[PDB]
Amino acid sequence: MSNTEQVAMMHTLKTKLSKYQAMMDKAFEEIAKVEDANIIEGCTIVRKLMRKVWNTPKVSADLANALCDYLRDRDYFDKLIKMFISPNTAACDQVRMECGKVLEECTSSANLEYIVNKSYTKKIMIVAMKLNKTPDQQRLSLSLIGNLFKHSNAVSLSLIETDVIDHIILTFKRAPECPDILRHAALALANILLYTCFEGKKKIIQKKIPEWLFFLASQADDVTRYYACIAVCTIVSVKEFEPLVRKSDTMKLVEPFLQVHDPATFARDYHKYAQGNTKEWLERLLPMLQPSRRREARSVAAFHFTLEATIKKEQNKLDVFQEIGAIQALKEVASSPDEVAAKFASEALTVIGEEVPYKLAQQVPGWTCADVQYWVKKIGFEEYVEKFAKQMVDGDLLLQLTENDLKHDVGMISGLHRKRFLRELQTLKVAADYSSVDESNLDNFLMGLSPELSVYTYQMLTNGVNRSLLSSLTDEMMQNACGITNPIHRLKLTQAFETAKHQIDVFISYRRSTGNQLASLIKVLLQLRGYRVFIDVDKLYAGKFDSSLLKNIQAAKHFILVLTPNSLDRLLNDDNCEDWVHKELKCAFEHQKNIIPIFDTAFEFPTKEDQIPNDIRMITKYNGVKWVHDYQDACMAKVVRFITG
Amino acid sequence: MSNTEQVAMMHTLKTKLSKYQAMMDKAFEEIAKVEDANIIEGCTIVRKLMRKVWNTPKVSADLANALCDYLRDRDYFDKLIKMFISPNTAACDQVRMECGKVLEECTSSANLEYIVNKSYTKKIMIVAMKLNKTPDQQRLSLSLIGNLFKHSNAVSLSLIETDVIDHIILTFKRAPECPDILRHAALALANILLYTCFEGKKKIIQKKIPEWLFFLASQADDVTRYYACIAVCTIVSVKEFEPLVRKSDTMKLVEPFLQVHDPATFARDYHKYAQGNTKEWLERLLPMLQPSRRREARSVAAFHFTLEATIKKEQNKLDVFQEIGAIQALKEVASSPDEVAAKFASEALTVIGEEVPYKLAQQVPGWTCADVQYWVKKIGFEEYVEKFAKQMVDGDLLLQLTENDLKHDVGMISGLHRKRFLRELQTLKVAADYSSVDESNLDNFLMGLSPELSVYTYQMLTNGVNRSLLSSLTDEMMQNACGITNPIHRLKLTQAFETAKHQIDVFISYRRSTGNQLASLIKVLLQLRGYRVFIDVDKLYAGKFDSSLLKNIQAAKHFILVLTPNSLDRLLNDDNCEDWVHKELKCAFEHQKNIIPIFDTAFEFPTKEDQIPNDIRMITKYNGVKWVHDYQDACMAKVVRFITG
Numbered sequence A, B: 001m002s003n004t005e006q007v008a009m010m011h012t013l014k015t016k017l018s019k020y021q022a023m024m025d026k027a028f029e030e031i032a033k034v035e036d037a038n039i040i041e042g043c044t045i046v047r048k049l050m051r052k053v054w055n056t057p058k059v060s061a062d063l064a065n066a067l068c069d070y071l072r073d074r075d076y077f078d079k080l081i082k083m084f085i086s087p088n089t090a091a092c093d094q095v096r097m098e099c100g101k102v103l104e105e106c107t108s109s110a111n112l113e114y115i116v117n118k119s120y121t122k123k124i125m126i127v128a129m130k131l132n133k134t135p136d137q138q139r140l141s142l143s144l145i146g147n148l149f150k151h152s153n154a155v156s157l158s159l160i161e162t163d164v165i166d167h168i169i170l171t172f173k174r175a176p177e178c179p180d181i182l183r184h185a186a187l188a189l190a191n192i193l194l195y196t197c198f199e200g201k202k203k204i205i206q207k208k209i210p211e212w213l214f215f216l217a218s219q220a221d222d223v224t225r226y227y228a229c230i231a232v233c234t235i236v237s238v239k240e241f242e243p244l245v246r247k248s249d250t251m252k253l254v255e256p257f258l259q260v261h262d263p264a265t266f267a268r269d270y271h272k273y274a275q276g277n278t279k280e281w282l283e284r285l286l287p288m289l290q291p292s293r294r295r296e297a298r299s300v301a302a303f304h305f306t307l308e309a310t311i312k313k314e315q316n317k318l319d320v321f322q323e324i325g326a327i328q329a330l331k332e333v334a335s336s337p338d339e340v341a342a343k344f345a346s347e348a349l350t351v352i353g354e355e356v357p358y359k360l361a362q363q364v365p366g367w368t369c370a371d372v373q374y375w376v377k378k379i380g381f382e383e384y385v386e387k388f389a390k391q392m393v394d395g396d397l398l399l400q401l402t403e404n405d406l407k408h409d410v411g412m413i414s415g416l417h418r419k420r421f422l423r424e425l426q427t428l429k430v431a432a433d434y435s436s437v438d439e440s441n442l443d444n445f446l447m448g449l450s451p452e453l454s455v456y457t458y459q460m461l462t463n464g465v466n467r468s469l470l471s472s473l474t475d476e477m478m479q480n481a482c483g484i485t486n487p488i489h490r491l492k493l494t495q496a497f498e499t500a501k502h503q504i505d506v507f508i509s510y511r512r513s514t515g516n517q518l519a520s521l522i523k524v525l526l527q528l529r530g531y532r533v534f535i536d537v538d539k540l541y542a543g544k545f546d547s548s549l550l551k552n553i554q555a556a557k558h559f560i561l562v563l564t565p566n567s568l569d570r571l572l573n574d575d576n577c578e579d580w581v582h583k584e585l586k587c588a589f590e591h592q593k594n595i596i597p598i599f600d601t602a603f604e605f606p607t608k609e610d611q612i613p614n615d616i617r618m619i620t621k622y623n624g625v626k627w628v629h630d631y632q633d634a635c636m637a638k639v640v641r642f643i644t645g
Helices: A003-032 A036-054 A060-073 A076-085 A087-091 A093-105 A109-117 A121-130 A135-148 A153-160 A164-174 A179-194 A198-206 A209-217 A222-236 A239-248 A250-259 A263-274 A279-289 A295-314 A319-323 A326-335 A339-352 A369-378 A382-390 A395-400 A403-408 A415-431 A442-449 A451-462 A475-481 A487-500 A516-526 A548-555 A580-590 A617-621 A629-644 B003-031 B036-054 B060-073 B076-085 B087-091 B093-106 B109-117 B121-130 B135-148 B153-160 B164-174 B179-194 B198-206 B209-218 B222-236 B239-246 B250-259 B263-274 B279-289 B295-314 B319-323 B326-335 B339-352 B369-378 B382-390 B395-400 B403-410 B415-431 B442-449 B451-462 B475-481 B487-498 B512-528 B551-555 B580-590 B617-621 B629-644
Strands: A506-509 A533-535 A558-563 A594-599 B506-510 B533-535 B558-563 B596-599
Touching: A003 A036, A003 A060, A003 A076, A003 A369, A003 A415, A003 A442, A003 A451, A036 A060, A036 A093, A060 A076, A060 A109, A076 A087, A076 A093, A076 A109, A076 A121, A087 A093, A093 A121, A093 A135, A109 A121, A109 A135, A121 A135, A121 A153, A121 A164, A135 A164, A135 A179, A153 A164, A153 A179, A153 A198, A164 A179, A164 A209, A179 A198, A179 A209, A179 A222, A179 A279, A198 A209, A198 A222, A198 A239, A209 A222, A209 A239, A209 A250, A222 A239, A222 A250, A222 A263, A222 A279, A222 A295, A239 A250, A250 A295, A250 A339, A263 A295, A263 A339, A279 A295, A279 A319, A279 A326, A295 A319, A295 A326, A295 A339, A319 A326, A326 A339, A369 A382, A369 A395, A395 A415, A395 A451, A403 A415, A415 A451, A415 B395, A415 B403, A442 A451, A442 A487, A451 A487, A475 A487, A487 B475, A506 A516, A506 A580, A516 A533, A516 A558, A516 A629, A548 A580, A558 A580, A558 A629, A580 A594, A594 A629, B003 B036, B003 B060, B003 B076, B003 B369, B003 B415, B003 B442, B003 B451, B036 B060, B036 B093, B060 B076, B060 B093, B060 B109, B076 B087, B076 B093, B076 B109, B076 B121, B087 B093, B093 B121, B093 B135, B109 B121, B109 B135, B121 B135, B121 B153, B121 B164, B135 B153, B135 B164, B135 B179, B153 B164, B153 B179, B153 B198, B164 B179, B164 B209, B179 B198, B179 B209, B179 B222, B179 B279, B198 B209, B198 B239, B209 B222, B209 B239, B209 B250, B222 B239, B222 B250, B222 B263, B222 B279, B222 B295, B239 B250, B250 B295, B250 B339, B263 B295, B263 B339, B279 B295, B279 B319, B279 B326, B295 B319, B295 B326, B295 B339, B319 B326, B326 B339, B369 B382, B369 B395, B382 B403, B395 B415, B395 B451, B403 B415, B415 B451, B442 B451, B442 B487, B451 B487, B475 B487, B506 B512, B506 B580, B512 B533, B512 B558, B512 B629, B551 B580, B558 B580, B596 B629
Parallel strands: A506 A533, A506 A558, A558 A594, B506 B533, B506 B558, B558 B596
Antiparallel strands: none
16 A cells, blocks of 8 residues: 555545534534434434444544544533433433434444443443333444443453343344344354453353354354354353353354355455454454364454454554464464364465555654655655755655755756645645644644645744634735745635624814814814824715714714803703714713813803703713913813823 | 547537536426426427437437436426326326427436336336327327336336236327337337346237237338337247247348348438437347347347447447447357348447547546546647656646646747647646536536636636635636636626626706706716716606606615705605605615715705604705815715715
């Protein structure tokens, strides 16, 4: 499998993770409504998504795992557990069903560990035992039960205390008409046997489980038979229980069942149930290959490891068999006289092949020059690798590259070759993880905004940009400092800040008939001293009378009221606030403007002050400037003092 | 056939598909009225279009198929089915007829599969059996019947349960006068026999069908005879049924009927009926070439395969005979002592010739360097191919090319060579599918806007443009980022975003005798300022006063009122809205015009403002301009400011 494919996988993973995180959040909004149909629909969407994820060509396992992690990280998993185990869920069993199905999809090793750490284990087990009303409930029950049985020996042994084995027996005995029940039963038995001590195995066997595994291995369903063969061969792998399985006759079915199948053919049937098979479950199956075990057990183990090798080739994770050392046991079995086992082991070793030179870390800033060399080589620029080495290019340096650097320091002459190269580098830039350095999850943010914007991450990050600062950038800063020359991309992120939401110094109020002199004079005089001073002289707009007359007051810090003879007279009995000086002054009072009356020399307050409306009457008590034409400069200085405080 | 022709075909296909999709939509808008003449006319147009499509020089089959797909995709096909089978259609059987004729054109393999998937099959069958009232009904009936008989064995067998065979017999027996009836009968018999199991074949034969096929093969019509010869030779190809045909002279007619024709002459005759001939129908005919079958059956099969080879040469799909392996059976027959069959088989093999090196995928971004090399070669740039290879050019890179890249990295020195090359590349760009990457069918949108604009698709798509954003682009973004340097093309898409929304600009209201000279001057001054400004004097014609006065206001955005010594006067107590200035101003308010009073130099509002009707009273509290004759230019500047903000 190529480095182009390593990149494509990483890229796809990051991309679809970002996408499915968002879609999962939407589905979790329907869950978080806490309404039956919405929880059902949300869980249905999550279920569909998780299955589609598992059906994704090769990143399926990683993408499933990452979403299982995200479910824990978001507490979505915790919420599902609570909204499954809660007795209130009896209001609609279909809510419990959909929650349970999702939990089934999400029962990763780390999710089961979470369940154990939070001690939900027995609650979930009992609630699975309560899921019994229909074959669907029974299948889901046996599934969740069997999934709990993928945790360590102590947990399985603790769960034996529930006597769920008898519940399992009764479940398949009730509804053998469903092959999927027989599958989930045989699965549960395989899992518990694989994940239990000698004592617990003995307790399981006492429930006539070898004879029930004979029953299961006698069914028409190859997946049930596969699990039944694994389960009995797990028992057979223990010396003292071989006679009990011999008495069950199941070993006599085992090898013929394997003989009439091929692991890779069975893989295509088994895929739906192969999804979620894991390293520690392989580590526990590995002992069944050993020459100490029965030919039957060795044959099952060999067939199984070939099947897994097939799947792990597709996943590009054949390394697991080297990590657990299974390759040695396969060689032993391939050399053994157990022809069936030896064939399957030889076939498994045929699938094993050879290692990758490097698995590249998605944290590409951490790349050594050796990594860059390998990448460059594999993307088909071999003749330049020596020059990259000579230039001592590293992960960080790659991310900074421009065509000039190629043109000059790499000496890479073809513009076309540069285009080609840069396309790969852009792909890589998008694909790369930055969480190594991105404290702010700016990468995640950009991906969410649009995936390609990932390309800019490292530049802006290294310029010291972070997720909080994005609000504050000009198109210039973006374009130049962050190098986002594409205006389309700039527009996209601009839309984020367009959607992230949701001055006058002095207003002059005056009498239009008489304050006209003093007010505009004040306007002009204040325009000397650098104040923005505004007044309804020469300015009105937008048709129906301009509400600017109050908006301009709201924007103003200071409110000057010109008081000329009889200026206040029309405010008398203006209780309906019809007078515009009233509207202006009321607005000033409501918005706590720094209000200054300026008294013309001839001004006098109205005799009937009590007739001034209550909301504005306070103006008769206010702090103001008696305007004296003789002392205009001093009067204006006083006005400025009231403005400056 | 050249790659230039592959491109021309692909181009034409994409082009005419876009066109005929739009035309089909128009016809479907007539159908969607659910009114007899509109359904009839729409279906008539679709029928004409489908026949014209079938008459299209090369791409006929693909274009027909793509439109059959589009019909399903648009649910147009579903609508036709419903509007055919519905009992309400008995209101006008001509509706059912036109729907049925269109369905006949549109009964591709996938369309028949749709019918089967939706279980409409028996409903359509029975309704076809009800189409019996005229020779036209009978022909269409036998057609739809025969078309249903081109689905797989189980469907044909299920339709035998209707005893439609007796209906078929009675139909042609009723109307022997019509060659087209005899054709659709012989077709239905050929199809059902070709698409049925042994048991169903036996049931068909029991309806005296060999003797009816004698009758049909005895008729003067060569197309009826062809189908009759195929039908009997289908029966003759089955061991137990040779005597059931041999009871009749039909095999004795068969070879002489072939002998007096040439497959290519018959192709030109049969064309009308040669349309729609599937691979699957060929796959079922292939066994009739085998040396196990009669000389008659081998002769029919050989003649037929020559005829089909003739048509598939024209359609550029000779590959079918390699895919189904018919070439081997033709070689066997060509080697056989069946001289007539051997001649036709030799002629068929003469037509077969040799394969194309590549059939290019219209998804040209997916092209390998090998594909580009092949393209470059075939467009007549062979001497550069090695340089393209050396430059490692791919599908994506081709789409990015500029003359600079040719000039430098290809070292294509002739500007003329570049022009020539770019012309082909533009053609290819237009022709190419992008749906591989275009989530939004922006390609389709651009094509619909104008086909050549396809040229820009890949650039803007790779810049991250999508169908939603197009509204929002500046001429700069278009020109520069999207590279649409042709302003004409920019204008075209500008028209699209103009018409993504949705003349007198300013109306002048006045009291006639006092707005007068000023009102007129306002028109003149605003016309000097470029506004199309009109007045009460101008816009009264050939009818009632209101009915010409007011319409100007709705089309205007801006509404000036000249306020004057009798402006508002006649509005007082005008509760019945009798005053024309009232009607004008009310209309302005109702349609939210940005209304601006212009106060004459000696203007006063009515002090008895409370007598102004409530719907227009707001005008006394409006943003206006005091006209002062001495400052006419400043006043008009102010008017412009109120208009523009």
